[PDB]
Each structure stands twice: as C-alpha cells, then as structure tokens.
Design a binder for this molecule. Sequence first.
Ligand SMILES: Nc1ncnc2c1ncn2[C@@H]1O[C@H](COP(=O)(O)OP(=O)(O)O)[C@@H](O)[C@H]1O
Ligand code: ALF
Ligand SMILES: [Mg+2]
Length: 1026
Amino acid sequence: RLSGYCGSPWRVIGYHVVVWMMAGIPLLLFRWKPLWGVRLRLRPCNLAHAETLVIEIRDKEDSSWQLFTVQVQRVLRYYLFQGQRYIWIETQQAFYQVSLLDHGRSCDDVHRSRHGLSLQDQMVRKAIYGPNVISIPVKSYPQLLVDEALNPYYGFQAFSIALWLADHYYWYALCIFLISSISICLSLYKTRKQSQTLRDMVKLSMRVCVCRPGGEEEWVDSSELVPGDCLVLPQEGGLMPCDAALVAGECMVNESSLTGESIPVLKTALPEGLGPYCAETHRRHTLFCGTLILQARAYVGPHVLAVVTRTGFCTAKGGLVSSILHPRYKHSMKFVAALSVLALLGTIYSIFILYRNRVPLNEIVIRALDLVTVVVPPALPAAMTVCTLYAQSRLRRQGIFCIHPLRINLGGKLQLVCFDKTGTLTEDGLDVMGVVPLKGQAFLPLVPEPRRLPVGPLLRALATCHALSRLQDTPVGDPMDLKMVESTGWVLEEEPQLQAMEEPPVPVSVLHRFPFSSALQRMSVVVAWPGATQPEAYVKGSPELVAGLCNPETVPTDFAQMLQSYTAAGYRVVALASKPLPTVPSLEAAQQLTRDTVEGDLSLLGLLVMRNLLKPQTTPVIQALRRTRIRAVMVTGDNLQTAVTVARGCGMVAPQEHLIIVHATHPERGQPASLEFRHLALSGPTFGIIVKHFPKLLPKVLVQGTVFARMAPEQKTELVCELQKLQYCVGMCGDGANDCGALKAADVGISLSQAEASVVSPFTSSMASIECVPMVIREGRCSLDTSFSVFKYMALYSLTQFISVLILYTINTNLGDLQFLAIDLVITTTVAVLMSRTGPALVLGRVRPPGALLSVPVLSSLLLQMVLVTGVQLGGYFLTLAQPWFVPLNRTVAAPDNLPNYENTVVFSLSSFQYLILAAAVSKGAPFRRPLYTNVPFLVALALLSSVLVGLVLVPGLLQGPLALRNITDTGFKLLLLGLVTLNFVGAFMLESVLDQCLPACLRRLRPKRASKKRFKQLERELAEQ
Ligand SMILES: Nc1ncnc2c1ncn2[C@@H]1O[C@H](COP(=O)(O)OP(=O)(O)O)[C@@H](O)[C@H]1O
Ligand code: ALF
Ligand SMILES: [Mg+2]
C-alpha cells in the first residue's frame, strides 16, 4: 500500500474565487472524478516545504481525502488522516507516521532505566502524539442537518417542490415535504443511535496519578501517558487508559473486550537481554488497553511500576476500533437505464398526444416538466434503509447483538462455516480420568486407573505447575487447571502468594511461575522445598513438542501406539516433563529469568487423561446445516486423532477418510496419501510446508480438507486469506483467544460466550450454542428477499403510475388534488413502512437466493404483470365508455376548475386497488419468509384500508365533497365494477403463482453451460485426477 502526497500553501487573490463562485452550479453533476475539482479550483505552483492543503494521488485505491495542516507551535505542521497523525521530518524530508522509537528501536538498555520523565519543557510531546484520550467527533442538530442535504436526491425533491408550488398546488408539495422531513428525522435518529452505541462503548475519564523523579506526587487528570513514560497503578483496579508495559513485578489482567475470553492472563516482567522490542511476541510482558487488573499489590518496594508504550488511536484497542469501524452491484445501472428509456418514450408519446390535441405551447411545457420530474415514488431512501434497522431491532430479542448492520446481506450467501472444538461444539468443563505414569518399573505402564495415588514428585508436579489465583472467594483460572487441582487434594493458601496447604511429606513453595502463551504450547515453573540440595523445574504441554525437547531415551517404542489408542476414544491426554535442575543452573537461572536453556534435558513423569463431552444441542444444528448443501469444516489446535474422533462422534461427511502419516521427513517433502485404518485432513506443519515448496497443490487439498488440527494462532489468518482468495464466503466461529486475528480477516465472525456487543467482532451472540449461524444466514436471506420485493414493488408502482398518467392524458383529464395524497400516503407509504414484517421461518431451504435483480424470470413476471394491468385498464375504459353516459364539455372550459366529472372517477377507482393488489402479490415466500397471515399489525392495517376502500364504492353519502367526487345512481357501484376488481385481484395471484415454479429455471438451464462460476466444472476437473 503506497500513495503520494502533493499540495500547495495558497494561491494569489483574484479570479480564483470567481471561478468557483461561478462553477458552483455544475458541482452536483461533477461528483465523479473529484480530483478534477481540486486540480482546477486550487492548484498553484510552489516549493515542497510549506504544504497546507495536500491532496493524494490515486495509485492503488480510487478515492480522495482532503486534509489541513494545522500549526500550533519550529513549524510543527501535522494533519489528521483516518485518525493517524503524520508529522514532518527534517532528515528524510517527507511525511512520516507516528512509529519512531518502536519496531526496531528503543532497546532494553535504555528502556530498563525509567528515570521518571523529569520536569522538562513538556511542549513537544503533547502536540505530536496528541492528548491521551479517545475523543469521538460528534455533531449537533444543525451540524448534522447541513451535511445531509448534499445528495442530488434532495435537490431533485426541492426542485419538484418548487415546480409544484409554482403551479398553484399546495397539497402534494405539503405531503412531499412531510415525507422528506420524516426521512430526515429517521436518518438523524439512525445516526444518533450509531454514534451513541460507540460513545458508550469506549472508556470514560477517571482520576490517576503520575510519578515524578523524587518525592513529588500530583493528582492530575487521567490524560498524561506519552510514549516513554512511567505511571503508577494504585487501588489494585483495572480501567487501563491505553497500552503499557510492565517492567517490574507481575500482574493479572482480564482481556475480555480485546480477545474474547474471561480467563485471567498472567503478566511477567520484562527481563534483561539486548534485543528488539516489538508488540508482536511479548504477549505476556505488556498491558493492553481495556484491561482489568485483578490482584497485584507489589513485588519490590511500595508498589510496582509500569512503562507506557503507545498512546492515542494507535493502541491495541483504539487501533482495532478504528480498523473495524472503518467505512469500506451492476444490474441497478441497466435497470435505471431501462426505466429512463421507458420514461422518455412515454413523455415523447404524451407530448405528441398533447400536440395533436391543438394546445398552445404555453400549457405544454408546464405539464411536460411535471411529467418528467414526477417519476420516483416518495420515501425512496427511507424504505431501502429501514429494513436493516428493523432487522437489527428484531434480532436483539433473539440473542444476536450487532454493533452496526453492514454485512447482513452477506450471511445469505454463505457456503463455508468453520467450527471450533472447545467451547463451540463441546462443553468447556473437563473431567479427570486418572494419571498414566511413565517412570514406573523402567518406563513401564502400571495399569493406570482413575484414583489419587501420588508417589514421589507427583504431588508437587500436579499441585504447583499451574497458574491458579484466588480473588476473595476461590482460585479461578483455566478449567483444566481447576479440574487438576480439585482432583489432587491440595488447597492454595496465601512468595507467600504462591503457597499451598496440606502437604503430607514436606511443605512446598513456588519461587517462579511462567504463564501460558499462544506461540509456545508449554509452561515452566520453579518448584522448591526445604530439605533438598537443589530445586526442580517442571513443564506441562503437548507430547509432540516435548518428545523432541528431552533426552532421546525417556520412553520405549510404545508411545506412538499408546497415544493413538488414548486419543481415538474421545479423551484429552497431555504430557508432563520434569528437569533435575542441578545446583549451578538453578543458581544462575533464578536471577536471570531465562527460557532457552531451562527447557533442555527433560524427563516425562506422567500423563493426565481428561474427558471432553459434546453438547446435546449440536447434532440437530449440524444436520440442518449439512442438509442444505453447506460445507462445514473444523479448525482446532488439538491433536489429529482427537479432531478425528470428535468429527466421528457426529459424522457429517467422511467417506474413505485419509490422513497424513507422521514420520515423513523427506528432503523433497513428498507426503503420500494413506488410509484411515473424498476428504483429507491437514495438520499445522503439514499445511505449513505445502504452501512454499510446491505452490500448485493448495487449491486441491483445501477443497476436500475438512479437519484442521494442531493449527497455529498465526497460521489461521493465512488459511482464511487463502480461502477468501478463491472467491469464497468462509466464516470462522471461535471461542478462545488463539483465533482472534482470523475473525478480523473474514466475512462473518461469531462471538460466542461474549456480552455487551464486544468489539472483537461485529456479530455477537448471547448463548453457548451453534444455533446462531443458521439464524444469521436465514435473517440475511430474509432481509435480501424483502429488499428485492420492496424494489420490485416500487418499480411496479412507478410503472403503473406512469401508465395511469398516460391513460389519463388521452385528451384532457386530470386527477384530484387529495387523491394523489391519499394514494402516496395511505395506499403507498402505509404498506411500504409495514412491509418489513414476515421474517424468516424456522425451516431452512436448499435453494440459494439470487444475487441479481435483472434475471429473466423476474423481468418476464414484471412484463406480464404490466401487460395484465394495461389490459384490465383498457377493458375498464371500454366498459365505462360503452355506457349511456353524458357528454363532456372540453375545448371550451379546459382549465383546472372542472375536476368533478365521470372521466377520472372510474380510472381512479380502478387504479387505487391496483397498488393494494400488487403490494400483497410480490412480498411473499414459502421457504424464505413468513406467510402474509402472521403479522397482526400489518394484517389489521390492510383490513382497515380495505374497509375504507369498500366504504366508498357503496352508499356515497359522505367523503365526496372535499374529495372532489360525484354520485351515480347506475350499476357502476354494483357488481359491474366489483366483479371486475375481484377478477383482477384473483388473476394477479393466478399469474404470480405460476411463474414462480421451476419452469423458467429449467428453460434457462439446459441452454447454457458451466462458466462464470463454473464451480461444477472445477469440481469435475478436480475429481478427474482421481
Ligand atoms: N494445562 C496445560 N498446560 C500447558 N499447556 C496446555 C495445557 N492444556 C493444554 N495445553 C496446550 O494447548 C494446546 C491445545 O490447545 P487447544 O485445546 O487447541 O486450545 P483451544 O481449545 O483454545 O483452541 C496443546 O498443544 C497443549 O500443549
Ligand atoms: F477448540 Al478451540 F479455540 F476452543 F480451537
Ligand atoms: Mg475457543
């Protein structure tokens, strides 16, 4: 990602203001290519040292952004671009981001001193790094009102209002203005809600203290953190201002709003060692933003000291917020082109008819302008943007809590869902099943049974090698750690904070404890006890990792079968190693905090066999997702056999399963295809070594691959990117923190076991089940179907209104004043506002919704529907003209003063029901949405409208004076018109429920072949090599 920056300070006075004062009219039409405006308006020639208005050149992205270099102080010229600050350097003589003294600099030799930020001239660090606060720009009511009238739609509406006011019409203009004001207030309410859901999510202000060198303490506001500072963390509480680094002491934070887990993580102080310092590998030495310190009193002295790393919008939480709250079709163009073509043809026909009627030109332009300016139904942007709001409002009452609806339509076109293993498909609580010793009788099994029989170092290695921590009620931590501690018989009591109780043979004390990270799957600990000449060091982790990190003679040639037999049953077994820890290493390592040499000559002691059970609400959702031709793979980090037996516990798709056999270390890395005892399974290193050597077999294994075990936290993002590169819609459903970065690089992200709409992912659920992905998919498909139906209904309404105007303008006839208002408000707006009902059903569908709005079936449906409408219209016209009626008085009183007549009455009476008929004929679906008899408010509204409509075609005693209607004593109000409107109402349904069959599909299916999404031919070519 590269881009240039060129600008100029200012231009000389003169015509540079007149040019933009005169060329301001075509600004509404010059929205395309915005570089021309900034190039012709203000673009003088100057040097390259005093830029004030800088514009960027398009190199990789077609966009444009305007900036302003503010100067508060040297020069100190800087601007705000997407929240990131850019300063002007003197050495490189170019713009530089805020990345100095980091990512390759600020070594430990100058970072492990922390003099204390002596009282110098603090005027250069506040204007460069900015204030230590996350201020969200908010807008007031006039500020939000002045910038919303920039769209050309509002200008067209204002022009229509002016044209209606300049024609002695104060009724239609009033309703149009009311609808526009309703749309404006709805948009302002939506913007206010979208701003309030973010302003309340960020942290608030507090009162903290900043330490100074010596005996100086001040109570300043909670904004003083600058890169390279040192603050104090009293009260043993959380509420972290921004990112920081703990250099002295240990602490435990709660990264629940940054990772997605409520498990306490232990933070270790930064040790010595001259090397690079970056925020990519020291995940246990720094403190991120939004962390809650559980219990950390002091380690050396009165209290611990923390070092500030970064402040502003580039922190861990602020950067993620700015990156995930960043603002990111072709058939619509042809649709509006055809609509404009039909409109111009109709207006040409109308002007030809008017010229044939021998009418002077003074009355032709006023009608032509009105006809060309009235083509779009009111509340167009208010009806297409309210469906997402209604969906977001109705999803809150089910469990899904989204931060902002942006990718709702993407859920309806999903084809691959990734599921986790622990926390998603299985229960989080484990169960112990005994200890399998490996040191008894010269590396021999002792028939392990589930009991509590510790001999020798088994008590300390099982009761001390952990990361337990109590908060006034009980030790809380990892579930496996709790299950191991409770199955031992030891109680942790309050270094005095790491002591135990009930020690039969000898009391024990924990000197040092190393936490667990995502990079390495192990954890060391220092275990000492009075009565020995040297302590011991234990470590717990995966057997495959500790097998090549110990003595070559620790287990005979029986582990490859024992581990497989223990993992092929559904249990979870781990390995525990031990180190003799002689006097010299224990003395020279307890004062340096080393890790490369402490994990050397290890010795296995025993194995902990756990038990993981699946959730009883997993098989129905899995079957429902499998019976809808939707691929579902499992991406975990456990052993291969564990994932295999977990997948076999349900058995979705596994014909002739194949696995990659271990002990494959060929120089050419040639992995063959073996048998288990169509689909393949990939491991961590197995998938890692097939992406660099041979870059030609990746799309062949990724399709059939459904079991991804032993994965790495840094490899899941690469897999997601490789899956998305093939034009897919893969979505991961993770629970732990090992797959946090993969959710930020996918289309959809599940946030199970979260709350308050965590920022870790836009979609967030409030239940521990997998029944949220199908719900999201069906909600998205229902929203897409509703939007398509609304667009089709709007197009049909526009076309039928054009046809009505055309048939009304045959010689000289105009509709009523209040009739247009009653049609656009009661008949059109009321049914369009309440059209977002009838959500998704409880049964999914195998057929996928279409992604285009200009298909052959829908176009043929619209064409046949309009043919039927014009046919029934001409039939009604012939019927009302073939009756013994009176004679008109045209060509002598032609003026807007003879509104009550028999010309437009029957036309309006026949056209008013057309909208109500077409509204209930396009918004319906059996497998996508709910039937029409489910929503009660819309049903009673339609009933009230139908009653009001039928109340006028019989006994015309009222609602005729102000409405400009007349009375008739003929059979017009009788079945003569009722039998016709009912016939049309039935014919519309009969014609709409016939083309929805698979006839057009099978007619347009046998003609073409598989190309342009030739996925079928791709699968055929893939299977052709078998
Ligand atoms: N008590 C423990 N102490 C240290 N490491 C452990 C412990 N339990 C599991 N591990 C490590 O975790 C890895 C598997 O993690 P996994 O279950 O995939 O995490 P997640 O379920 O969050 O994806 C194993 O390689 C193992 O080394
Ligand atoms: F099984 Al997991 F994150 F819980 F891979
Ligand atoms: Mg998880």
